[PDB]
């Protein structure tokens, strides 16, 4: 809280809070991490696809990799994977080159398209953060999936923005309270990279008192 700019949460917390509410608590509060095959593959792909200091353009559009972004409306800071600028006299001028370009955030993740929100929310967050810096409006996003090697379009509406704001508020409250919640296990936490840590088993079993009494009185 040096200048209110140190009380910021990473964008990566949003997807974790969306998928397994306890996963974000373990990762971002207790500072724990464990890797499996899929995590290694994703990390290697992201590291290979992280090429800063270079710009690739086709005369009309431009791409920027590893863009540091921050937002004070949500107090959220992070790094976007790819931002694409298209040439059209509609948006706002950007530093470095001339003309007016419009912005589109694209982030790479490895996997099938998921029924849950997850990915979408993170993308939406980026848009908000982006529209806090360039002073404009973004109404479109793209997702690249490497497992199927496809690109999927994502619109932005008011409901997604309200949901993102609500989840950011909840994350800030939870981080202030330093509380790790409990979530329904289901079949989700079989590929939990922190399965040996987040321990889904003891959530559904009997109280400690009952087992002690049962094994103690006989």
């Amino acid at each position: 809280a040096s200048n209110e700019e140190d009380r910021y949460l990473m964008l990566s917390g949003l997807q974790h809070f969306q998928f397994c509410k306890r996963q974000w608590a373990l990762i971002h509060i207790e500072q724990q991490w464990e890797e499996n095959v899929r995590t290694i593959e994703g990390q290697h792909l992201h590291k290979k696809a992280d090429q800063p200091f270079m710009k690739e353009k086709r005369g009309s559009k431009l791409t920027v990799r590893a863009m540091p972004i921050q937002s004070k409306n949500l107090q959220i800071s992070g790094i976007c994977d790819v931002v694409e600028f298209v040439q059209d006299s509609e948006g706002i001028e950007l530093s470095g080159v001339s003309g007016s370009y419009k912005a589109f955030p694209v982030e790479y993740k490895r996997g099938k398209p998921k029924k849950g929100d997850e990915d979408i929310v993170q993308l939406v967050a980026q848009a908000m953060c982006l529209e806090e810096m360039l002073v404009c409006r973004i109404d479109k996003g793209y997702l690249f999936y490497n497992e199927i090697k496809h690109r999927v379009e994502v619109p932005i509406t008011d409901a997604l923005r309200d949901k993102v704001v609500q989840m950011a508020k909840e994350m800030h409250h939870y981080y202030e309270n330093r509380h790790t919640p409990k979530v329904k296990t289901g079949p989700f936490c079989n590929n939990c990279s922190l399965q040996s840590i987040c321990l889904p088993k003891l959530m559904n079993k009997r109280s400690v008192k009952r087992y002690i009494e049962g094994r103690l009185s006989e």
Binding site: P52, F53, V64, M67, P68, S95, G96, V97, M133, L134
Partner: peptide, 12 residues
């Protein structure tokens, strides 16, 4: 130093 389109700077 290098350049970034948002006004930020990075080291070489």
């Amino acid at each position: 130093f290098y350049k970034k389109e948002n006004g930020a700077v990075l080291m070489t």
